[PDB]
């Protein structure tokens, strides 16, 4: 049996794990819920529980946490431990009886579950990009310290780039690691975008677009702050550090081309220009159950692609003019050191202001360049905890520099 | 270094082959080219001789031997063992300086080469699907006593097939052997064709067409034959076949997808519903280089896809009314036995008719179905020597009763 904890589970990712799981245990029972933790959602924690029957329960918000207690009390024959806090996901992650965890959870939390399930040598299934652009060399850093640890990719594109290659491969080696494409004959990527809302708007038409051109009839379903890095394309350019750091190839080898189908998730060019693909409907479903069952795969009845029915697939290249939130990952990339930590936290202030109304489209691109050039590169701390506060400050500083800008503007 | 024999080398199989090996050992000393083998182009296989210095060279034409003796001479500093015919070929099978073998001819000595390289134990890289359709089940007897010998597929739909799958479930098992499918998870088989230069006639157009117009403006460039059956969708239908026996595929679980733009060459459906595919420029290189790199791939300076450039992918389904020879392949396939045998023989026999202006474009599914209502399913040979006859006889029979019926309507 496959033992699963899921932080975040009442959020996206962690619904949809649930469901998968819930779907693939029908067919064969398969995977342990170990452990769920939630922030405030008590109620829907309870009914979650009431299903899944997992050995730990934990909340975030202790204001909830009695409240917990006694709503468990109506599950027959069940005896829980009930945590709460950040001591209950400590707790958690020690857990001999847990194997794999879920990464659902955004931001700091986010980050510092991984940190912990990292240090007690589990598999983690991570689909906070944001935490892999910010923290890549923190990440790496652990990664290289507790050997048995791995993240495996839960992002669309990450996850598809990750199903194009060879096991007997990539079980040399893992996710995050120095020469991660040369022991997997990687060559280049092709990392596949939607495109977002506005692939056929001028320049003009560009400069007044508002938040709800961005999120109103998503081609998607998916939070607002990700609608709107899918319609900047901020949200690709994330994705293209992410690819560096997950899979260690260089920025010069990876390509967005603009899928708008969403039905290729991405794809691999290998040293001898064959390439792979991975393709199925758009359902973060696959993406989450790959990462819970790699290196293996399990039945599902999930709907099968009818390719005929698809009938068209299209691709072009973005242009870096109309979207040059692309343009700006890609120099923070290459430009090193702590730009990616820049470029994320900017981006995180820049894009709550479009969403607020408060500024305009070309302004995100210019808040966030100016962030970048009032960076100065710093040395990288060679000691893990040092290395942490470095990216935290650095955080903090740039999220600040953009809210600054903003307010001068103002 | 991978030690390799060519057997066809001056056929269009066995100089792609030579001039990837060409090309990857400019890069890096990969391939030794142990071994050549031709029918009776002396002066070609001198050239080759010349460039390549192998330590065999084989003519199967005793008339010519003589001549390529003398020929060798010219060339400085090479003593080559120069061998003729059959044996000839026995002989490079059995040396053990020889570790892969590409079956580069057809027929008879297509499958007689490859049961030699099958009983020395041999990795055999096998462009001839005709063995596979029509002797299939001594394939796979063959390799379940030779416990180290080992197909893999060239023919390039069933190169990217194998291409999508996980090396680690791979090496647990091998092409021809019963669970193949089971142990790599596969679900089902999208085969893609190019459609032929027919796709969008009507049937009153269809009625008419020529071999002239088959082989005509030909989209890609290769041999009469497999022209014809493009053009018929034939070869569709000689490769589900080849498909069902390569990786024990349940012909209700493999769908043949027109794809006109042949840059995605097939697809891997798995249990999850994830799928995975195979993409390159029309190009034989690719699948025969893997089929000498498997499990590992090299480096190459061939030209990188470019998608944005191919820019429109289309797929639709094939009709059974206008392609009826695919129908035919099916049922053949479903029925079992020998079946295969007999689609198989009777259409060379419909195809060389119809490419010599004999038989109209339905004429050559009317003999092949007319054929198959004739058989008689009969015992399978328990015994490899006898049953390689039974196949033999089949075969024979088959071919003259699709002749038979001919010389009557004519
Ligand atoms: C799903 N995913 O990983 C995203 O990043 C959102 C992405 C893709 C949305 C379509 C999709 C949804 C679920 C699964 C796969 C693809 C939007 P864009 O490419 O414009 O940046
Ligand atoms: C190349 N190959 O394996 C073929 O069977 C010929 C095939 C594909 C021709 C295009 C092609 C050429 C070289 C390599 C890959 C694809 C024609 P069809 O699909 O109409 O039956
Ligand atoms: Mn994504
Ligand atoms: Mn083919």
Redesign the interface.
């Given at each position: 049996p496959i033992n699963v904890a899921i932080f975040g589970s009442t959020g996206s990712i962690g619904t949809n794990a649930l469901n998968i799981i819930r779907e693939c245990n029908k067919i064969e029972n398969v995977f342990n819920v170990k452990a769920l933790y939630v922030n405030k959602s008590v109620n829907e924690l309870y009914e979650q529980a009431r299903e899944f029957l997992p050995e730990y329960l934990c909340i975030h918000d202790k204001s909830v946490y009695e409240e917990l207690k006694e709503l468990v009390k109506n599950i027959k024959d069940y005896k829980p431990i009930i945590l709460c806090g950040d001591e209950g996901m400590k707790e958690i992650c020690s857990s001999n009886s847990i194997d794999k965890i879920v990464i659902g959870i955004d931001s700091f939390q986010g980050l510092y579950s991984t940190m912990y399930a990292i240090m007690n040598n589990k598999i983690v299934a991570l689909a906070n990009k944001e935490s892999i652009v910010s923290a890549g060399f923190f990440l790496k850093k652990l990664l290289n310290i507790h050997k048995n640890a791995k993240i495996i990719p839960v992002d669309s594109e990450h996850s598809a780039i990750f199903?194009?290659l060879?096991?007997?491969?990539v079980?040399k080696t893992k996710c995050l690691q120095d020469n991660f494409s040369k022991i997997n004959?990687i060559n280049?990527i092709?990392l596949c975008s939607s495109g977002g809302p506005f692939q056929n708007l001028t320049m003009d038409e560009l400069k007044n677009v508002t938040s709800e051109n961005a999120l109103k009839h998503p081609k998607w379903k998916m939070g607002k702050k990700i609608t709107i890095d899918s319609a900047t394309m901020m949200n690709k350019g994330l994705e293209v550090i992410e690819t560096h750091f997950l899979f260690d190839v260089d920025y010069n080898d990876i390509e967005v081309?603009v899928h708008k189908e969403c039905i290729i998730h991405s794809?691999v060019?290998?040293?001898?220009?064959?390439?792979?693909?991975?393709?199925?409907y758009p359902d973060m479903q696959?993406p989450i159950?790959?990462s819970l069952?790699w290196?293996?795969?399990?039945?599902?009845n999930?709907?099968?692609?009818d390719?005929?029915q698809?009938?068209?697939?299209?691709?072009?290249?973005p242009s870096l003019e109309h979207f040059p939130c692309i343009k700006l990952a890609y120099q923070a990339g290459i430009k090193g050191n702590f730009y990616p930590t820049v470029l994320n936290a900017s981006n995180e202030i820049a894009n709550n202001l479009f969403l607020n109304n408060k500024i305009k489209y070309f302004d995100i691109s210019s808040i966030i360049s100016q962030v970048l050039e009032s960076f100065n590169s710093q040395k990288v701390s060679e000691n893990s905890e040092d290395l942490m506060k470095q990216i935290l400050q650095i955080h903090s500083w740039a999220k600040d520099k953009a809210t600054d800008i903003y307010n001068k503007h103002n």
């Open positions: 199903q194009c060879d096991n007997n491969k079980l004959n280049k092709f081309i794809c060019e290998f040293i001898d220009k064959s390439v792979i693909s991975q393709m199925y696959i159950l790959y069952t290196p293996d795969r399990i039945k599902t999930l709907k099968p692609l390719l005929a698809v009938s068209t697939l299209t691709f072009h290249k």
